[PDB]
Amino acid sequence: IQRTPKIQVYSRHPAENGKSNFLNCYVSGFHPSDIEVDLLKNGERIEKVEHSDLSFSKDWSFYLLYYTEFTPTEKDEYACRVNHVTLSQPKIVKWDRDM
Amino acid sequence: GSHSMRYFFTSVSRPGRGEPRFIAVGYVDDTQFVRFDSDAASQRMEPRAPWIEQEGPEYWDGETRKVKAHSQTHRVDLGTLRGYYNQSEAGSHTVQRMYGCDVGSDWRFLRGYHQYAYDGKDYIALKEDLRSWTAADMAAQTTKHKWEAAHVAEQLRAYLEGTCVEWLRRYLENGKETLQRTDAPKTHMTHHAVSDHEATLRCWALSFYPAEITLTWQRDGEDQTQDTELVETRPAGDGTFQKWAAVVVPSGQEQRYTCHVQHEGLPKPLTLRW
Amino acid sequence: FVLELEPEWTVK
């Protein structure tokens, strides 16, 4: 089978510009498990991003959390870039403070 | 409330070279407490919660031995299943296994389960009585016959009703500080004016545990699903969970709408209003 | 506490 990933990009704590936080990209509902997930700062790949251990839901679809420490600002733009066999090109989801 | 212990196993074949990628994770309720990853350096079952670290070398040796045995069973199965379905020797395929036990508020056996899938589809699963099997196709039906002749269900039932519950109870007591704590949702509402005539109210639930939660909108005291959005509950990364629900409303009519939050940590459900 | 998975319990 093939299931396309759902993506949520969000902060661990309510965002305040200039204060340290954690940037999350939660990818879920996908199959097979091979997936490429990057966190971006102004389009550039963030290094040393960690992720959870692969697990799955009742319907067998996989989920993973990718995360890194970050300090939001007014100027800087953060995003999650996901590639998967189901996607024709990489799917980029921008971070917003209200989601 | 009820409690559960669950293990999840994923094996992904790598037929170009080497053994399958194998990842095992153990949960008590919504808290991961152990892991094994075939790509990691230790080749040991590793702790992922403070309350399991106290377990001695006998425990860790045993868990490592058993989880490696799981990996080898999956390795064999990936080889044979490729043969049954006449699939090429080049392509990657997946076996997934989940099992565990639920207990009630009294910490006594409620239900057990053991489910197995090939390439993300049901293969064979133990039925609720723990004495019979649900086989999805003819490969799995042949497996059912094999496992019935070998009395697999009886031995799995012994684990799920007995061993699983005993160790779940041990973990619940040893990890009381976190596992028996309920974190009620921290809630607030935000407002965004998309235009002069339209606004979005978003009702937030943050920092809650366990993950089970219900968020619903009402307008003038009756439920509304029209013009609402509800995101999947998501991990915060500190062991707690997050969720939100939004409703689109006419500008100036925000006071008609109320968000209702149901969670174990809340003695009575909460109501939020702009 | 993981199951003692017996060696015969492969699918084939």
Residue numbers in the entry:
A (entry chain B): 1 to 99
B (entry chain A): 1 to 274
C (entry chain C): 1 to 12
Publication text:
CD8 T-cells mediate immunity to Toxoplasma gondii infection through recognition of peptide antigens presented by the MHC class I (MHC I) molecules of infected cells. Structural characterizations suggest that these long ligands interact with the MHC I molecule much like canonical peptides: The MHC I alpha chain forms a 10 x 25 angstrom groove in which peptide ligands are anchored by their second (P2) and C-terminal (PΩ) residues. Surprisingly, T. gondii ligands were significantly longer than existing structural models can accommodate, and a series of peptide analogs demonstrated that these longer peptides are not anchored to MHC I via their C-termini. Crystallographic studies reveal an unreported structural re-arrangement of residues in the MHC I binding groove that accommodate C-terminal peptide extensions, and this structural flexibility is discussed in the context of infection by intracellular pathogens.
To determine how C-terminal extensions protrude from the F’ pocket of MHC I, we bound the extended ligand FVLELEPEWTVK (UFP16-27) and its binding core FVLELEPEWTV (UFP16-26) to HLA-A*02:01, crystallized these two complexes, and solved their structures at a resolution of 1.5 Å and 1.87Å, respectively. The 11 amino acid core of extended ligand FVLELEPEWTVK interacts with HLA-A*02:01 in an almost identical manner to the shorter peptide, however, both the main chain and side chain of C-terminal Lys12 protrudes out the end of the binding pocket. However, for HLA-A*02:01 in complex with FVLELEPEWTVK, the side chain of Tyr84 swung up and out by almost 90 degrees, opening the binding groove so that a peptide might protrude from the groove at its C-termini. At the same time, Thr80 adopted a different rotamer, further opening the MHC I pocket toward the end of the α1-helix. Lastly, there was a subtle but noticeable increase in the main chain distance between the α 1 and α2-helices at the F’ pocket. In order to resolve this enigma, an HLA-A*02:01 crystal was solved with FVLELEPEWTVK and with a version of this ligand minus the C-terminal K. This led to the unprecedented observation that the C-terminal lysine at P12 displaced the Tyr84 residue at the end of the HLA-A*02:01 binding groove. As such, Tyr84 emerged as a “swinging gate” whereby a longer T. gondii peptide extended straight out the end of the HLA molecule at its C-terminus when Tyr84 assumed an alternate up and out position – the open gate. For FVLELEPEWTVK, the affinity of all 'mutant' peptides was significantly worse (t-test, p<0.05) than either the binding core or the native full-length peptide. The melting temperature (Tm) for the two extended ligands exceeded 62°C (YLSPIASPLLDGKSLR, Tm = 66° C, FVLELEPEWTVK Tm = 63°C), temperatures that are consistent with ligands of conventional length. That long ligands can extend from their C-termini in a linear fashion out the end of what was previously recognized as a closed MHC I groove was unexpected.
